[PDB]
From TrEMBL:
Mg(2+) 2 binds at residue 27. It comes from Thermus thermophilus (strain ATCC 27634 / DSM 579 / HB8). One of its GO terms (cellular component) is outer membrane-bounded periplasmic space. Mn(2+) binds at residue 27. InterPro entries: SBP. Keywords: Metal-binding, Plasmid, Signal. The keyword Ligase does not apply. Coiled coil: none annotated. The keyword Metal-binding applies. This is Iron ABC transporter, periplasmic iron-binding protein. SUPFAM superfamilies: Periplasmic binding protein-like II.
Amino acid sequence: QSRPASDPQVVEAARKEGRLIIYSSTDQSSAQALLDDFRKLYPFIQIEYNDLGTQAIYDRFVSETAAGASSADLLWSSAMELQVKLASEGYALPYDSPEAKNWPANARLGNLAYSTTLEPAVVVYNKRFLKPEEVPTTREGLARLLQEPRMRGRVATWDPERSAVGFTILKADYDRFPAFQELARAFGKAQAALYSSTGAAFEKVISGEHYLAYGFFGSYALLRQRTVKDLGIAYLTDGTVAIQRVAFINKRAAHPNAAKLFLDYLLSLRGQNLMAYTALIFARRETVVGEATPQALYKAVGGKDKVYAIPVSTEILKNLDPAERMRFLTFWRQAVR
Ligand SMILES: [Mg+2]
């Protein structure tokens, strides 16, 4: 492919920095090919990739900043509310990425933070327990399946009280899809187990302890499928929540220029193509080729109209308002117990 269009003076300043600290919720097993390809472009950048939980990224970054400590150069996290909160509160370096000129307004927070992905919340299942034909592709259908005695104890979904991105996804589902309330009651009926990481849910599904998991990232499911033939993916045809993994540069980065190079790389055709084709991370750009693409998602759900892309906007900070959080979690807690 190409090289990202970062200014040659940023490249020279990144070479004097020589180092890049990343705090990321992107599982290293998915991120690795992007780190490897970024090092081929810029081998003089020593990367410290910190694979961390979404809430752990926000708590660590805020304390280290409060203490005047060494923190990250770049934060990359699926917990969209916590990224937007930081980037709208003075923590972000303002930077107009020359790779984001065609980003729509709802995929960027001006010059403070950026969408890097369009990642669907999907259904995964174990083909030894559920044939593809048995797996409903709507919230109503899934709620009916979860009335079956045989499904009791055989469902996984997020714990929105322990995963900040589990909150992002289930809260967006709750806000947009009336059918979600009926589904959440069916989670209660089926005694759903609640997980705070995708791999923990997936291993239960792979072992057959659960037959089906709702709401986890299509990205991770596609990569896991390469080595697990019995892992099925179903896309919701009544409406799919998509998260946009948000990246921003630490205003107090020790290596701002190295962080600019990495952000430009993530947004570039080269980076987005590597996401779609090799990392199997569902890319933001619609001009990418591979399995993990907007066009493959749109085809699976029956069109772009059936995707609800959570915007990279301070409007989503509504979800952290105390009364709003209380309404959703009081509903959730009652439905699922
Ligand atoms: Mg992760």
